[PDB]
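retry 2 of 3: previous attempt timed out while embedding HDD. Reduced batch size to 1 and resubmitted. Inputs unchanged:
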Amino acid sequence: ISRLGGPNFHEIPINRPTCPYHNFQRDGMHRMGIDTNPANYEPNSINDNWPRETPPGPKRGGFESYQERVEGNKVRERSPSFG
Amino acid sequence: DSLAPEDGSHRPAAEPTPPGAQPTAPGSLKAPDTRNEKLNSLEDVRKGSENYALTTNQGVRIADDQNSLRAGSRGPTLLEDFILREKITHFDHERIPERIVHARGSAAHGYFQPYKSLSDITKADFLSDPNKITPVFVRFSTVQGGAGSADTVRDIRGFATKFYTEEGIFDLVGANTPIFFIQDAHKFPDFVHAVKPEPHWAIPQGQSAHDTFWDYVSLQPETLHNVMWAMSDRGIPRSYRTMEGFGIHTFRLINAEGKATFVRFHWKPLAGKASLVWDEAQKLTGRDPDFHRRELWEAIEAGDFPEYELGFQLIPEEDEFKFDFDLLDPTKLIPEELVPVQRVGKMVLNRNPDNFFAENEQAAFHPGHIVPGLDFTNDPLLQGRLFSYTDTQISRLGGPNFHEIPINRPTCPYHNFQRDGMHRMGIDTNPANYEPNSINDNWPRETPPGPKRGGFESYQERVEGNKVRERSPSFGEYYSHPRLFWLSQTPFEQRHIVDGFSFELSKVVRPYIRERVVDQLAHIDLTLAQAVAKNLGIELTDDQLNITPPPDVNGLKKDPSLSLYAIPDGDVKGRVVAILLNDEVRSADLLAILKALKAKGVHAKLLYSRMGEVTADDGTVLPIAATFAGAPSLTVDAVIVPCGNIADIADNGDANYYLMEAYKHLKPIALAGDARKFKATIKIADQGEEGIVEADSADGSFMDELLTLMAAHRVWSRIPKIDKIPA
Amino acid sequence: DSLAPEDGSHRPAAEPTPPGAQPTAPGSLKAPDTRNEKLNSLEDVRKGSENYALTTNQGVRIADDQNSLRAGSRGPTLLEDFILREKITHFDHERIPERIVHARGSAAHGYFQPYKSLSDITKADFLSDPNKITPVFVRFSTVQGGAGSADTVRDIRGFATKFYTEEGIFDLVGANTPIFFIQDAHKFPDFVHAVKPEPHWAIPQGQSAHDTFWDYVSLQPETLHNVMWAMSDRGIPRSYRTMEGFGIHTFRLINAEGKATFVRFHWKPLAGKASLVWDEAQKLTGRDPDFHRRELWEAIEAGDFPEYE
Amino acid sequence: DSLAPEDGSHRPAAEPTPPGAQPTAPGSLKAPDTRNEKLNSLEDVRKGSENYALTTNQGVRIADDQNSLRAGSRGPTLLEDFILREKITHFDHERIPERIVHARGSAAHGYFQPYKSLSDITKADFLSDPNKITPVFVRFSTVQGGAGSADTVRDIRGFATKFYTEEGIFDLVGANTPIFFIQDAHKFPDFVHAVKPEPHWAIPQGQSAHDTFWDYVSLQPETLHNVMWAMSDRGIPRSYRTMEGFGIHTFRLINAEGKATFVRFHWKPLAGKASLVWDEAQKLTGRDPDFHRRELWEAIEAGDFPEYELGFQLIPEEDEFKFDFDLLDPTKLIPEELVPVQRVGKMVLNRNPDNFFAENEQAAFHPGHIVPGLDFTNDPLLQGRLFSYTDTQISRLGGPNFHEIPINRPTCPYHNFQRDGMHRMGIDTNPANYEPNSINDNWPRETPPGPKRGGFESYQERVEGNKVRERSPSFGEYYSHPRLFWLSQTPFEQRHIVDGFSFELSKVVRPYIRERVVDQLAHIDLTLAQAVAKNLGIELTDDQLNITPPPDVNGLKKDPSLSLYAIPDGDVKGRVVAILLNDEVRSADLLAILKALKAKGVHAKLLYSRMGEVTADDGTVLPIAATFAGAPSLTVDAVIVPCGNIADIADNGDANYYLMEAYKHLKPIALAGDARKFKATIKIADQGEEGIVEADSADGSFMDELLTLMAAHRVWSRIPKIDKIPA
Amino acid sequence: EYYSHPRLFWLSQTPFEQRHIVDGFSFELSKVVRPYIRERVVDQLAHIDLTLAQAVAKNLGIELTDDQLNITPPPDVNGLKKDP
Ligand code: HDD
Ligand code: HDD
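retry 2 succeeded.
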């Protein structure tokens, strides 16, 4: 945000994905992309909810975190195992 | 040169003065004796002006500040004019990014004091002793509009309090409604974008009356509760002084023994609850877009300090699951009939800022700014808010040194190993910039948690579950709170809700979105849905007619604390009365009128068809504050027309319209002597009607009757009479 | 889930329609066949949306845009939710400083064409050939108010035209009155501070009716000429389409032989001159603060293209 | 906690101590009683540390600064950890843009005082009385490299002085050579881009030895004069204390009558002029890239305060066109033989900063920042500089309020109608933010120009001519100054210039560039041109050999003030001697050595093959400062090898190498008793050699000879002998 | 020179435009809290046109003084008494 001047640093040439990127984020300093989506939010019926979420799958699915088991108290504590 | 007028009328008196009597002024000049620790701490950066030479920013005296340096008096401006370039450069970079939301806000300084020690339930230092005074800086705001948007729009209002405590900044960042529109912070941008001006053309400003807002609302039923509050009169407060305040989220209080108590924060307006009516609020955005900002400032200058009572809804850890709704769900309120608000302390706002930009615009509030004795909960909206408020000021306030901006600075000590960053003010002398260190003997040092003055330690809440992107099933109920709110409103409040929805939906261009919202309302209450549907020329289907209403909230079919007006809490101090003058006013009425108002701290504005003066019947010279068109009825709370030469203003359209507008907006109207001729303007029968004070003169009970009407705020019985009337 | 109605009434017809007939929309969707060199040159950055997967800014498909990642469904949000932090970070940094002056403005794209070659008096390429079209982008504005202030206030209006010519950008940055309030730029900050919201309390917005402006005017008689224009009905135009445009200053035209000709620039509204009346304008700031922005956008959507000579 | 050593040896003594005796420290901790108005005025932002609690920036005490908040001790970090995020956020935004040029610099605080009142020629307040003490902040620098580049590169050096006068900030932003490379500010970006690291790969750092630099130079003959200074030993100063300072541009002095005098500013180093030799400089960039920064800091901590004499070259307005060069041409110097330097005052640098980032990195120097009594000229380089230095800190320092950053703040009053801007610190209480105003009675007010405390008024210079983008024909002469400079150097200085050009052009990959630069050298001097050409394997042409040299500068065929060494002025106070120890040192030698050095203020570093200590013959325990490899001879001014057990170090490669390096680099070497066996390693005749001190022991006479050699800096007669020593 | 153009503009307006100009100044000046500021502006209006000055002054309940009533109107602009 300070180093590259804002939240649009992914629009700097070198940082641009080569694959498609579409979402409901807008504006920010030095905004390059000009969005034509009628909607800047989801869910929306005005652009028939596009761009749309994608279920996780074997290929080309949405990102879904591994459902790791969490259990313990909220602590600021180093694990004894790291000692 | 020496341009002030001999007589010193350019300068306002440094003593409390009613609204409009003197030119308003910077707080330190208007009330120099009103102090607190934070106000005194700002003295290092306060800058005067009088008797000082005009200079550049580098301290060089300027000889000629009217002209650019040029080659010849009609020649080209030279690049060497550094005085011109510095003055234009500062001007050219004056603006900073406004807040993403709540850009429009009005702020003041004040103080807080607890009624009694709260040590049994919290170790927070500012609540530990009744004699402990905590300086505060409060900012009230709207949500959607930009910094230059209008004040009296229909919107939620922000209510942020910066508590400058002895153990750190505590920021209580709330709103004027007890719930928020969404459940999880991940959809904040979605909701905000939907309510903000649409991206193609940036319309509309300060309004949720547009397709994208209602599109989102219709697809996300969790928003219905707060939508109900916004559509009610709560969305158009009379002033920041007459609205409630809430922290919304369930937080924790942590005592010295380590016991956690759930808490919801409340602010009770000591001036009471009061709102405008839609037509007045909308019109008032046009006649005076700074109405709330002005009213706040002028109340403080008159000495009518906005006073609020901090209150706590306290829920034992063992009762976390005893309600129909989840305590961590921010779209759900905790009914006061179930959990009473316990009075905790008083906040008094008694001084305006010196410079709006420096103090108001640069102030940074953030709900993650808590102190030992307080803690968070897992409320999913609150959780995400903690990320946002530190993040956003890297752009808004240019960097991570924003706590060094005067208004944001802690009054208590602050020492750590953080260094550099843009705009670095503090010059650290610590030999070490890391810990652990031996070269400065590990200072500054960590401090263990303890009963008082100890380090922050989070409450050891048990966390158990899988890493999931999942809404708790307990959050999946959307209509029972909306319904509870609906049923707690008076009949005229309900009509106003119906009217808000109807008006807003009429501005939605795509008819199907209107139908879909109507379908949602039918899940809340049939009467409500039917009435809105009728105003939109939509017919409910038989299926919609049999949607079974949501269950009561823990057995409650209503809760009168949810209404603005069901339970009287009328305060008249700080209100204002318009006085329609004529060119031969009966001075006796005027003396009776003005003294009765002053006795109760009610202000008056003397209006006429032009500015200047008017001479009463006995030669008393009356100073005119404004013309009838210049200070419309929208800005006052009641109108009085004293006896005198009524034919002077009898056929004055503006004067007549003044009364028609105030009559329509349900404000008390009082007519003395021949001012009763105006009754035919508002269609009042000979025998009179509740809400209209009338008598042969302004003597006897005339002012007490008028003041009783003001105490009840508006004449709600007149609603049916306003239906027709062309105003 | 939440989808378009069956009838396709969510989307505006892509043809000229009268104000109110269809929901308004982005220019390239409303009038896809309306082109010019500048508009086409913007095609490298235009981004569609229909039929595309919702992603992060790094191009990663999002499975659930309804929730933060947390330990248990009633648990604390985790710091590793990069989807959430990217989304919030971008939101948190949406705003950029508004213009010091003229913050409130409405803009449109268009084209310019000279009536005849003006080569005898100027070698400027965009005025050299009657059949050589120059794409424009025009921004109309108010002066005092913020970007969120109202449109129909009493104020001077800005009229800025960006000409994308073959020999460079020419910006003709003017106003709706033929003069300005002050004589030397060194006093700009004094004049602007005087008309802007007063420094202690930041009131009033988009209004010159306050002590400091009249104080300045009273001590600086050079402001009287533009003040006269501001106080007239010129200060509350009915539409951006029905006001004059002026460059104010004397500039020069230079021809190919080196001759200099002094020039003052004018814009003549082909829809005529028309203003509101004060009571109407003031009430209109309340009933529709976006009236001029809305009126301009709808005129263009209707085929009633704002034309200036 | 208690990590500091119980003996207290982690904290440096708050007394002046020699280099390496103590750990260096923040200026106010090292010399707390060294005071000046500016330093005292920074006390409001200085922050301590000892005995304080570690806090967030919001003032919240931290209990555990070792761990993040996580669900279970091996669980995921939680988003609610605000203590972590604030610490990481600040860290993440620590860096600000470095200076476009002069990014690498070292700074210190001091004071200036005039020798006499200069009221006859200037009404500048800081020069009006010998008893007026003006605080200063001086930043020295290189030009090309980034902030992390090395100090002893070959480059021009910046010399900026911020004078905190009582009538404003006056920044004298100069360099260590009397001219600049270019004539018009419009070509600055071209020159800088040419010298800076090449655009595709960003190589090379801190060096002009690359194709683009020499390409630009070859095509722009105006650069040759400053190129000559840079290729001379002037480009590699021994220390910032031992180089000259110049303002470069002709400015104006304005007296009370309003008479203008043309002036060029000069800084004379009272420590004398001294430079390293190229191989020593280049190897010093690798052994200690912070050499100059360290030397400045350590001299001030030892009480060897860098002292400079301010001098003025004064030319009457009527003499403007009396030289055969234009006074406004920045590529032209004013020979001191023609216009003598008038000694005006003295500046003493006596205190280091507390925080480098806060005071040095954030300081903003600008040549435009002048005060009444001073004025510009039409120099086209200076003219364009006036736009830049204000402009550049809008990004570098984040906005238009950079003057509120502590180090930049004027000590005198500053008041104006400028408002807001990112990170606004000042809170203006003025009712008005415009002038003229009547509401604050027009304050702050303008001030007419006058003899003292008057507003700034530009000298009314007559401007006549057409608007033209054209170089003045008078500036079109490029070889006479270069020739004058060349002819004013000693034979060995000329030889180092030849070597400078030869080394640099050797690194230019495109051979035609080397040839074009040699062609330019042929317009300056045939001898210079032939010598450089022969090192490049280039043959001058017929025509090149016949180019007539440029004319003398106003009859001068040389000016000894342009040479570093032609006229003796060396000072040994503050220099350092390396003393090579052995395991049984003759304690009588040391005693004598150290006593003599301390009498002249020369420092010593005791070196051995390992750390710890050695014991002299009498049981004197001697503490080792560093190893031979640890503190190479590059870091000292001379090397002494005392008598004792020489066989302990006589086969020590590093010991022998220490002497060969010092020898190669023309440093005085002193050998006592059996240390004379080290003569074989540097091939010194039995009978001796000037520059090598040798005796049976290290006595008074021996120390006198060594100290005499050190005052002459280097042993120039040894040059023709270092050729045959493999080091 | 500050009054000739203001006056040229004033005389070029129709009667209803002139009234609207009057109403604009009167409205604006009524919102000026310091009365001396209003009076100073009215004084400046008397240097432009007395009919205009007097109409505003009356709406502000201000009386033009005898000196104000005797201020000579500014010269016409290169002979123009109006420009439609
Ligand atoms: C995750 C994002 C997030 C969420 C879900 C919320 N907001 Fe927020 N809030 C913002 C992100 C934010 C912000 C972008 O960080 C803001 C913009 C300006 C700033 O300083 O803070 C802000 C400011 C802001 C302020 C104005 C502070 C001032 O006056 O400067 C108010 C009173 C609140 N909001 C109140 C709330 C409450 C009652 C909300 C729901 C309980 C809420 N906000 C949800
Ligand atoms: C046209 C612009 C330009 C030109 C012609 C010059 N420079 Fe410069 N210089 C700058 C534009 C600038 C700058 C871009 O504005 C800088 C760098 C960063 C900053 O604060 O100022 C600066 C920094 C800077 C500094 C560093 C101040 C400090 O230590 O922070 C020194 C000593 C000089 N310059 C000196 C010179 C000399 C003596 C010049 C020729 C006589 C020269 N500059 C020409």
